[PDB]
Amino acid sequence: KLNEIGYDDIGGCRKQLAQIKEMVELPLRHPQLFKAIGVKPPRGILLYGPPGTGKTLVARAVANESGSFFFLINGPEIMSKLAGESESNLRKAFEEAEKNAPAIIFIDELDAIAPKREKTHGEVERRIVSQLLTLMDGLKQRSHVIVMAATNRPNSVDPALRRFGRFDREIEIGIPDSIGRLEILRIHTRNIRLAEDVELEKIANEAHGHVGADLASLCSEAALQQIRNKMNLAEVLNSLAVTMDDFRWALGKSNPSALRETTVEVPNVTWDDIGGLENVKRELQELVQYPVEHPDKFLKFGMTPSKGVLFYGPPGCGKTLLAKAIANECQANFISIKGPELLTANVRDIFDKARQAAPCVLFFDELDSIDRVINQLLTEMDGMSAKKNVFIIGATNRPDIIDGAILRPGRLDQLIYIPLPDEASRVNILKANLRKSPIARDVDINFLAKATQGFSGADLTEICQRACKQAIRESIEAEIRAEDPVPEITRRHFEEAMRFARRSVTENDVRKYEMFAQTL
Amino acid sequence: EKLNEIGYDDIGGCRKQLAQIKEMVELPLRHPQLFKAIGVKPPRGILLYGPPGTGKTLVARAVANESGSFFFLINGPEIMSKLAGESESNLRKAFEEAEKNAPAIIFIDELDAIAPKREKTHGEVERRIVSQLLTLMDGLKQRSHVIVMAATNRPNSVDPALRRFGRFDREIEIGIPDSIGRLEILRIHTRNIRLAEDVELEKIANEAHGHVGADLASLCSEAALQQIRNKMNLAEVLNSLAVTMDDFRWALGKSNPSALRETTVEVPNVTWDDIGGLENVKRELQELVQYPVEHPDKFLKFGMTPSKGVLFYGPPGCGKTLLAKAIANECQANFISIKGPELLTANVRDIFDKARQAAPCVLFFDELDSIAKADRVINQLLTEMDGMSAKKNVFIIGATNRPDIIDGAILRPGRLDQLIYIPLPDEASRVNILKANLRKSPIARDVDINFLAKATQGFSGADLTEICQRACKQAIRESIEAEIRAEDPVPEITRRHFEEAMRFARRSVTENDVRKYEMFAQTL
């Protein structure tokens, strides 16, 4: 079975799979063509990412597809041997790989073999690390041996290993996105018998923070729930088919292990969902979309584009949603960071993660909360080339207390005010909020927008929530009394919600923001 | 085979240091008669250091090949990967072999792997090998012509006992190449690549900032990869492959140099024409930073030691840094641009030592206010400056925007005796700045800089740059919008764009601030 694993049996990493394919397969199938022009093939590739992804099979998939020899060195297995056994085994591994070429050597759990030098506390451990380094540098330029390694964090690996010529290409196999999750769910359910009511797309969309292993466990739990419901009360053996109810139940009881891991992807929020102003949209377009869309114009006119902006205004979800929408427009990855998250050298880490994604929209929320971290952010921004397509966006609700250093040119040089949404914006927001709900025909959104003025996006969302709570309360009470009288939200529900206006922004705050704008 | 042919030409990015090493090694190892006659003691330990990838690992081999001497290589990890007695036997066997075949050169690559700081060593085998190395080092009789060269990332990671007066007394830094060095490296690596006729490596080298030799090798590889990707994916092809300037630019776009955070030492390419500047300030800086270095004889004749430090205070902007870079450029002295934020994040002495190593240096300290009036850094800097021999051609320049806050200690004589002020640029300065800003971009013949300068008064360097930047964005905006309509209409930036940018003409420096600076000057 192992030799039969291919590209199709790995899900959740298709971009990285293409990268690895071009890096490895092509040289190992037409070495003459690459040598002619003079392209040097890579000699060390380090895959890293959260545990549970498919990065342990990537090496096997590549080796099988390229039809090359494959050798596996298991970190814990090597470190579980006597003093000389580990050295003999590393040497034998590399020698065997050289014997049969082209080859691939996968050193699973490298951080087990070569942890940070501080962690090591014996002569045997350091001797093994140095043995690995010596073997690594000994790969002749034409040996046709590619060393692949996997870890959780490259920082846990001995830095000497991450030098030129030893491990110079580092690829991240991160959390899958919705398409990746669907791919994994379709891979794992190959043998399970499904019912006709299963729509894996919804499951994939709803499974947040799930890695391939988590999805395998989820499928197993759903099958078990089906067994429980059926057998509890050969005929049955042939009448078993997991149902969407079982999958939803399994989702309910699941505890994904990758909840806290930052997510990088292209969000699915469009302009229509926030509405927003026109000037702000135009400015954001000019800043972010044009340089990526038409770099030629910037080059010919020869002025380097600015990197980041700094939204200010009353609190709410407009700023974050606006940034997400602009990122969606340009099809660039979106990275969200919260001040509380940062308070808990991570700054360099997140900046490098952004730099890895070519079009990225690095978002920093609650920037006001953020001396050491401030200086680290300052230096990192100052040391960001204004020619790489990485855009920093800030957000704050107290521009007065923001340190002026960040505002200095080259770091964050543009300020944009985000006012309360207007009538059209409020209409768009309300339409988005009730998008997934069965609203009644009588209800008109335009009148609601006219009635509500000065209400922040939070206020409108709260208004929608109050109405739905009323509908649920009515349905339950009617159901109890009856024991679909309330099939859709009615006007009375919305009016009852409106009974408590609760405007979250005072006119004094708006005047203060206006004064801040005028002073600029 | 190929190893024994590496020479001076096959190393790039280090030409000053290569000349130093040539004089310091090749000549003694070819004409010992003269050196012994006049009585010059050849060095016995040379420690090369710098960021990884710079090609210092070939310097030893290049020198050995050129001088025709025996060459022996000891690889740190290789020695430390053996059993307890194997590493000792190997060090001893290396030095014995080198001495047996004289003259020789011994290159101990990755010294810090063999002899780290005493504290970092926990076992006894590690300390035993370090002591073995020290014993062998001291055992080199002056008569025997053995020169030990070692390479390490930083000299501090090496055991201090090694950096003694008879072991490793010469330390050479091989740091990031400059633009000429980058061009040299690119020429070396593209020897076997077949390039197209539109490739002009000068622009690549100039734009490749923070790249080391290895990074440039990767860049060339990626460009070739892009070319093959496009053409092939879309024997004839094998003979039609030629990298193109588009491929090199694309490779640059997607490259992540590993030496971005490393301080750069180099003569800046900024001239007086790009800053304008008051004639008084220009003359004063000329005197201070040029007469001592250009006519030391006169200073000796009148016997007054030149002051070392100058301060700059005034409105925030690009003026101070540009002025310092210009004065450095005129004297062709190296420029070090330590910023305050970098220092906020031992280090002070390291910067001062780096400056000292480059004799004519224009060490720059921006935003000094943040560091000074904290206690630790300010005291360390005061101590280090006070220990700065005024007879050396190292000039310290400070910049600040709160001249009222800096502690008076820094301005006491012997530390920073001059207190020049940098005021807002005048009309001619603004004209020069605008000409420089638009120099790289096409401009309409109608557009006149003189009127724009006349309109702009009190505008800081950023203000002028902002004006130019805003105008270009308008031109790009208009240029593209026409393109979609047609789907060149805007070949150059027209005066309409400049006037539209001028519509929102803003002054970033309040006249109150300028008056405050004037008050400080008068009180001073």
Ligand SMILES: */C(=C\C(=O)Nc1ccc2oc(-c3ccccn3)nc2c1)c1ccncc1
């Ligand atoms: C939306 C985020 C959101 O609603 N954020 C938010 C709501 C209310 C807030 O009040 C404050 C505040 C702070 C200090 C003083 C007073 N009030 N901050 C608030 C923030 C959202 C984000 C991302 N995706 C979707 C929605």
Ligand SMILES: */C(=C\C(=O)Nc1ccc2oc(-c3ccccn3)nc2c1)c1ccncc1
């Ligand atoms: C130019 C650098 C430059 O213009 N930097 C700069 C612009 C504006 C600034 O405002 C402050 C400041 C300080 C304190 C309070 C308020 N504002 N600092 C500023 C710095 C330049 C540098 C290097 N090479 C070329 C040009």
